[PDB]
């Protein structure tokens, strides 16, 4: 049930390949309901 | 005796006099302002024919009250009906000059005389005999201090032609007019009158009788309605006054007419007492079947009277009439917007209430946080539903938290319904419990589910405890960790700690919207969250400044509310802990009876026990008496929301940022008594050192030592007796001898030798140690020629020993 | 500008990408440096950008795991315009793990928005002048910066260098120095100068200038153009075939046309087909006007034409001006609006600027949790709430919770229309009952058959209107003596009149202050039943409370707000006048305090004085003292026994610096407290104090002492007393000794000296003798005289 | 001065309808509290 | 209100007056009773 | 306070100032301050 500062380091601990993509989101999908590796890693 | 006149009111003048023919009145008679007319007749008209008035008499600026000399004397009030519990009132007269009506006894009612615009002669009348009237004590000199009188057959005119009685410690003569006064009777002959010559009337009489020992000439009644040669000498079987009985049926009728009287006035009377009374002892009730008073199951069985059927309560003081009640006939409405306290005031009044019949509503209130101040309520009948066919109605109580501790209370309602509207601080679990306890859940089956409590925490979790350590003045505390889903919303912890002399406390028991602050509250900021939740530090805190021996009570988090989910950090079990024992404080101030060396006992258990007080210690470091004077050449006679919104805003910005920046693809010892005895010591203020400890062990904890110093009497006494052996020298020199059992402890009170010539004055000289030790004797001063007598005495008062002077003659030059 | 212009950047995950900005002077957008895990202070050794001068929209930096200071990243970032903010913030420094010094020592202005720096464990330089940069400082939000823990040395080059070297700024009177990093400090322009900026010397520059000035007053040598920039100088418009563009620069027709063609066919979304309208290159022409494909110009209104907005998914959660900005010009909305503004910081300005053109919500307008919403009047052109889709239970309007919503609308001149959807109201503590009722009658779907709650709306607000203004004000310095005018259809509708009274040191007192929710309050509540309602209105009594016990020199508040008892369902509109901050007339002050006087010298006396605890007004300029020099008894007293014995026109506080006194003076000093002396002689009781000029001594025996030789072992001595012996001489000590022998002492008092004219020596043995004489005064002992040798007769 | 109708209306407001208000409040120090004692108790 | 000395002087001139004339409809006729 | 803080930290710790005094320190701080 990571929410906030934990979600920051959670993505750092997961992957370095695409380093987050860029050009309802992660907080809605992961914070309130404790997402898993499936979608959390997708934000790489 | 004679005609009977019904009591009727007096807008007329000719009705001012109503004593013409009817010697008794069947009702109530009183005079008022009436027609504004000169007292031409009333100032001199005499009509003492009437002797008795059944009910009270009232005066209201009656014009006729100007001068009274012999209007109508010999008036003993029956008091069947009373006004303000008065069978006679002297009030509202604006032009009264002389009070000379001249009164034997007023029955069942006091007399009011205070706040009279015009009154006099009050200091010359013994109102105690007519009635004690201690209930009100309004019989005071209104204007006798300014000498309103203008007409006294006592010491004022010389010869005392009137009877006298003690008034405020003064033997004030009974003065009413220039010569009139009160009738006198022997003390044995009371409450039934007597003739002019002092002859006592019959025991059936009421007031002075024209014919002695003739109840026919009287106007008294009989409690059994004999209606003739009635008898009223009450035997023990006859249960009103010394000469007036009630037996067993008069007092029965006293309550029979009032049996169905659900009003004031007519009241029920009990025959169980020797004198028929309408009241009963605090633990005694009128018997439903029997007619004698019956003890109750509990004290104060009083049922509170109803008015109009509704007795609403607000601002505490509206409930003052409900100090003690058992069952309430009518309906109750409760609405307490605010106040000072909840339990100390509202539970102090409505706590004792036991049962209700019909309706009770919590209309609109704020101060009520815990409803459990209704401490003893058991059953509300609910046979009379006021509105909506309801029985108990809770409404508009924004901060009402607890109805009753349902593990303890057993309140049940036979009939009616419930309703809870606008009750935001009371979770639905509590109302469900109340319905289960009330017996109307299911049986005799209106819940808002939104206006009821939903802004406060419910569906609570359990917070377990952990490591615990303490000292005598500092208890620590550490508990298990717990986080809601979105951990940052949890603002922190609220720890509530509070004293607990006994192991029975709850949360809201001593609280209200007034902020009683029974439970001290502290807040702890959350610990830093750590990965591997096992490695997280246990959320901890300690508080200081405690007491070293009390059984303390301790136990809830804070959560910023989210609309999506209602989750709150719960409370913890009320865990009772006691700080470890330590040293007690200074002992109670000691009391010593240092009577004798063999008779010394000490008397004290101070506050701050800091453990079971078990060990007492005693010491004494001193010396009995000085001994320097014993051996040296010394003379004994010669010796000298805003923050919540801030947190929510910070969380909102965080979630916006993360949402937009992420995209997918030695001594003595006693035990329990004060002290058995102290002895062994040898006539001095022996200094005794007393120490109070905690318990009897080498690990005892002892306070500062209190000190005791008190003087014993000397167990040793007379010390020198026998004849005064002496030798006479040729140069007028004599010698003295004695034996000295020198015991160096104590002081001889006198320690001197007295010598006196024959027929001359007596002189004494001190005794020195060297006289017995060094000089081996003593020598007197210059002795004049003649017979001389010598006295030897040394006592540590003495019973008196005849020291033989053995008179001797010295050389005469 | 010396460098080109570059669009918004989103550099992340690696430093090598930052080189895309090496050649930019102004960025027409936003700069974002998001996530840099591998960085350490060494890793940023060769990175800098002094060429960047201006950023229009904003700049935000997120986790950079090694960067520590911005003094080296871009020094010359002069101005941030804030055309497109980031959640009301034009500068966001968030989760900067190692950021030691904030940098930005050459930032001048931020025209729009606020700044938020938060959650950084190494930045403690921010306590150095936001009023200089930002017009709005309340909406600023700086917290959790490792400086809130007070553990920083605030090392400042203008402060840590020693003596103060850099500008200081007054904040609540603190007036503390301000500075960025430990290398630079403020360059605050002169107060006379304004946002135009100042040069190094500190003088005003050209009006169109902004922040910094390469040359004074030169449009061609300005660092930031305050209004527009066309070819090298700053101008207030675009006179030739230039047109305003992005509100910072002018471009010709060719540029606008090329930009239009650049996405007339290109896939690039977000790009607009720029039109020339009101001599501006606006991305899309506003309501009414619409562009013709002829020459990229905007036609006049082609009949009534609305502007669809089509909010995504039919719902927009307006919570931030960066989201309200997306609705600028959308007259008719094809979705639903959910205002959710939180955390104070009223946005009525920006909300009115953007949403003030909206007219027709196609969905349900709902206002939930909006904490700062004081009114809904900013919807100044709301006509129809179409309510095509309702919320849950067929609700069009919806107010779940708004802790300050009062005005709603103004039905004096505002018409409203609801197609359907009932009305919902809950937990609005200040929603006026009359206002919501007016909403009910005014298109509140009163017909069409058609969820208000009863006491959860406006449960902490008043609904009283009758301004029964106080007839007149007459106020004693110690009591109220005024009253209020009278005025319901029936006196039974008039429960009574009660009054709120309390001391008003300031004039900020409001109705909500000290109310029922306040619990403990200073309001003095007294109820007065209205007097007889005579048939002649001229005979109106005008009830009044006239309470006594006033402080003569404090402002007071009077506010009636008469109570009333009525049905909770229907009630009269109550009666209440306006609160009046009535002051009080100053009177004679109270007893003066702290009278203490210490003699500055023998001839000088000074005193310190303090006003009473609460003086009854604003002042005294004269202080008395006792008329005394010294007791004449001390002139004659003998101490030779062995082992036996006006006013000054000065302020009371500290102005008594009187001098020229006698050396030995001690007496009473008197002073009082006064509020006025020249217009009306109002003075308090005079105080009493004494100052001792004793601790001073100046003038011993003056003049040599000769001798007189007498045969009968008698020697006489004489001298002259000093003229000013610091007061009076109390005695004289004389010692005589024969040569080669012991010494003998003697004492002469002033009384003895009056007749002896000196000292007399007796019992002197034959031979050569000597003598010494010393003077003794109350102030102190003098000095012994020179020895005098004489011959005693020898037998 | 306030000794005229002002005092009588102040008294008739605080309390409604030889040591009077003339020599106790009119020409002497007084307050609201002192007004009632002259009125009926 | 007139329930104080006013009622007592009116009565002196012409279930007490408190609940029959002071707080209820009344006339001079009702005062005498 | 400051030094009685030291005493309290001797208790808290187990077997292992002008700051605590001034700001009424928490056990969560004295728990790691005591440990050497």
UniProtKB/Swiss-Prot annotation, chain B:
Residue positions the entry lists as glycosylated: 12, 21, 74, 105, 208, 247, 287, 329, 389, 410, 504, 595, 612, 787, 799
Phenotype when changing residue 741 to L: In RMS; impairs post-translational processing
Phenotypic consequence of residue 792 to T: In LEPRCH; abolishes post-translational processing; abolishes insulin binding
Extracellular side: 1-665, 666-813
Disulphide bonds in the chain: 5-22, 120-149, 152-175, 162-181, 185-194, 189-200, 201-209, 205-218, 221-230, 234-245, 251-276, 258-266, 280-293, 296-300, 304-325, 427-458, 635-766, 693-702
Consequence the record notes for mutating residue 25 to T: In LEPRCH; abolishes post-translational processing
Sequence segments annotated as region (Insulin-binding): 654-662
Fibronectin type-III domain sequence ranges: 586-647, 720-813
Effect of residue 423 to D: In LEPRCH; partially inhibits receptor processing and autophosphorylation; strongly impairs ERK phosphorylation; induces wild-type levels of IRS-1 phosphorylation
Effect on the protein upon substituting residue 710 to V: In RMS; decreases post-translational processing
Record's protein name: Insulin receptor subunit alpha
Upper classification of the organism: Eukaryota, Metazoa, Chordata, Craniata, Vertebrata
Name of the gene encoding the protein in the UniProt record: INSR
Full-protein residues shown: 31 to 947 of 1382
Swiss-Prot record, chain E:
Annotated region described as A, given as residue ranges: 16-33
Role description: The insulin-like growth factors, isolated from plasma, are structurally and functionally related to insulin but have a much higher growth-promoting activity. May be a physiological regulator of [1-14C]-2-deoxy-D-glucose (2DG) transport and glycogen synthesis in osteoblasts. Stimulates glucose transport in bone-derived osteoblastic (PyMS) cells and is effective at much lower concentrations than insulin, not only regarding glycogen and DNA synthesis but also with regard to enhancing glucose uptake. May play a role in synapse maturation.
Protein name according to UniProt: Insulin-like growth factor 1
Domain of life: Eukaryota
Disease tied to this entry: Insulin-like growth factor I deficiency: An autosomal recessive disorder characterized by growth retardation, sensorineural deafness and intellectual disability.
Impact when changing residue 24 to W: Found in a patient with primordial dwarfism; uncertain significance
Species annotation: Homo sapiens (Human)
Shown chain mapped onto the complete sequence: 52 to 107 of 195
Gene (name only): IGF1
Oligomer status and interactors: Forms a ternary complex with IGFR1 and ITGAV:ITGB3. Forms a ternary complex with IGFR1 and ITGA6:ITGB4. Interacts with SH2D3C isoform 2. Forms a ternary complex with IGFBP3 and ALS.
Entry's family note: Belongs to the insulin family.
Cystine connections: 3-22, 21-26
Annotated compartments: Secreted
Coiled-coil region list: none
């Amino acid at each position: 049930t990571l929410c906030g500062a934990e979600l920051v380091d959670a993505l750092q601990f997961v992957c370095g390949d695409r380093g987050f993509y860029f050009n309802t989101g992660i907080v809605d999908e992961c914070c309130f309901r404790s997402c898993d590796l499936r979608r959390l890693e997708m934000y790489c | 005796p004679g005609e009977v006149c019904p009591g009727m009111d007096i807008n007329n003048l000719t009705r001012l006099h109503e004593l013409e023919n009817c010697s008794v009145i069947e009702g109530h008679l009183q005079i008022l302002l009436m027609f504004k007319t000169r007292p031409e007749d009333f100032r001199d008209l005499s009509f003492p024919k009437l002797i008795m008035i059944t009910d009270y008499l009232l005066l209201f600026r009656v014009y006729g009250l100007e001068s009274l000399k012999d209007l109508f004397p010999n008036l003993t009030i029956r008091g069947s009906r009373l006004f303000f519990n008065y069978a006679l009132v002297i009030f509202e007269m604006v032009h009264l000059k002389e009070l000379g009506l001249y009164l034997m006894n007023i029955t069942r009612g006091s007399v009011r005389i205070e706040k009279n615009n015009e009154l006099c002669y009050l200091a010359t009348i013994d109102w105690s005999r007519i009635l004690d009237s201690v209930e009100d004590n309004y019989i005071v000199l209104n204007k006798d201090d300014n000498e309103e009188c203008g007409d006294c057959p006592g010491t004022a005119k010389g010869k005392t032609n009137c009877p006298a009685t003690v008034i405020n410690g003064q033997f004030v003569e009974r003065c009413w007019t220039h010569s009139h006064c009160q009738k006198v009777c022997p003390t044995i002959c009371k409450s039934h009158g007597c003739t002019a010559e002092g002859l006592c009337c019959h025991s059936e009489c009421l007031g002075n009788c024209s014919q002695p020992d003739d109840p026919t000439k009287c106007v008294a009644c009989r409690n059994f309605y004999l209606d003739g040669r009635c008898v009223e000498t009450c035997p023990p079987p006859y249960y009103f006054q010394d000469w007036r009985c009630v037996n067993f049926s008069f007092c029965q009728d006293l309550h029979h007419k009032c049996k169905n009287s659900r009003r004031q006035g007519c009241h029920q009377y009990v025959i169980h007492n020797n004198k028929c009374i309408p009241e009963c002892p605090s633990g005694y009730t009128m018997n439903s079947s029997n007619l004698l008073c019956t003890p109750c199951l509990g004290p104060c069985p009083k049922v509170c009277h109803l008015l109009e059927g509704e007795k609403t309560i607000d601002s505490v003081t509206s409930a003052q009439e409900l100090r003690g009640c058992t069952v309430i006939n009518g309906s109750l409405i409760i609405n307490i917007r605010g106040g000072n306290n909840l339990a100390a005031e509202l539970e102090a009044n409505l706590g004792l209430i036991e049962e209700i019949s019909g309706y009770l509503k919590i209309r609109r209130s704020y101060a009520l946080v815990s409803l459990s101040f209704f401490r003893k309520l058991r059953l509300i009948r609910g046979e009379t539903l006021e509105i909506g066919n309801y029985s108990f109605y809770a409404l508009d109580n924004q901060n009402l938290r607890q109805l009753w501790d349902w593990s303890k209370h057993n309140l049940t309602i036979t009939q009616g319904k419930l309703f809870f509207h606008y009750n935001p601080k009371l979770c639905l679990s509590e109302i469900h419990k109340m319905e289960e306890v009330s017996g109307t859940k299911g049986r005799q089956e209106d819940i808002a589910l939104k206006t009821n409590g939903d802004q406060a925490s419910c569906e609570n979790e359990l917070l377990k405890f952990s490591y615990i350590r303490t000292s005598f003045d500092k208890i620590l505390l550490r508990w298990e960790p717990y986080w809601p889903p979105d951990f940052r919303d949890l603002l922190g912890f609220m720890l509530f700690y509070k004293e607990a002399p006994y192991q029975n406390v709850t949360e809201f028991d001593g609280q209200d919207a007034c902020g009683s602050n029974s439970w001290t509250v502290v807040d702890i900021d959350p610990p830093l969250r750590s990965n591997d939740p096992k490695s997280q530090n246990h959320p901890g805190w300690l508080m200081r400044g405690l007491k070293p021996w009390t059984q303390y009570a301790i136990f809830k988090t804070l959560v910023t509310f989210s609309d999506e989910r209602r989750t709150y950090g719960a409370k913890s079990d009320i865990i009772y802990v006691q700080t470890d024992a330590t040293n007690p404080s200074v002992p109670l101030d000691p009391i010593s009876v240092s009577n004798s060396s063999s008779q010394i006992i000490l008397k004290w258990p101070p506050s701050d026990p800091n453990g079971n007080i078990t060990h007492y210690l005693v010491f004494w470091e001193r010396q009995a008496e000085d001994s320097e004077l014993f051996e040296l050449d010394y003379c004994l006679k010669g010796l000298k929301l805003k923050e919540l919104e801030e947190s929510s805003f910070r969380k909102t910005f965080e979630d916006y940022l993360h949402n937009v920046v992420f995209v997918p693809r030695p001594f003595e010892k006693v035990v329990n008594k004060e002290s058995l005895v102290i002895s062994g010591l040898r006539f001095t203020g022996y200094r005794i050192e007393l120490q109070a400890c905690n318990q009897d062990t080498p690990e005892e904890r002892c306070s500062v030592a209190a000190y005791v110093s008190a003087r014993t009497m000397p167990e040793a006494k007379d010390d020198i007796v026998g004849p005064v052996t002496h030798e006479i020298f040729e140069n007028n020199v004599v010698h003295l001898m004695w034996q000295e059992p020198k015991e160096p402890n104590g002081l001889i009170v006198l320690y001197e030798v007295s010598y006196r010539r024959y027929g001359d004055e007596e002189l004494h000289l001190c005794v020195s140690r060297k006289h017995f030790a060094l000089e081996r004797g003593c020598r007197l001063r210059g002795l004049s020629p003649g017979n001389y007598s010598v006295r030897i005495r040394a006592t540590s008062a003495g019973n008196g020993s005849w020291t033989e002077p053995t008179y001797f003659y010295v050389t005469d030059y």
